[PDB]
């Protein structure tokens, strides 16, 4: 995926519920720091539902890849409010985004 391109889809679409650097505030949802590799609901400090919390799976590119396209279909009860990510391309872009900015 394009990075760059994915930055512009999490700016417009993810931005205004999660923060991605180190030390980022949570907010409606968690910080995103250290996201790939981690189990789901892992994040200190926030307070997930129980429905993400023993989803049980890893967050990666593939399981994101998933999630991204429809969220509730991935983890029924999420309280994550959107719509889903239609186009395959475009969750490579914002996976690409996330896989470096939730890294550095
Ligand atoms: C496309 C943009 C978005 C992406 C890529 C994204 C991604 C994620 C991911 C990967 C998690 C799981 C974190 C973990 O298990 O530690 C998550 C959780 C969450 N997100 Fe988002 N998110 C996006 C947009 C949003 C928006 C717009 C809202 C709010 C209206 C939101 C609300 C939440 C909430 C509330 C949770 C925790 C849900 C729960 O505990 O069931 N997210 N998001």
Redesign the pocket.
Known sequence: GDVEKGKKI?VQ??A???TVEKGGKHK???N?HG?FG?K????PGFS??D??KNKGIT?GEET?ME??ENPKKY?PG?????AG?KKKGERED?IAY?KKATNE
Request: proline letters at 3%; a positive charge; glycine letters at 6%.
């Open positions: 999490f679409k993810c205004q519920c999660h409606t949802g968690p995103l996201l981690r789901t609901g892992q994040a997930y539902t429905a993400n967050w994101l999630y991204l983890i999420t309280k994550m409010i959107f990510i914002l996330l």
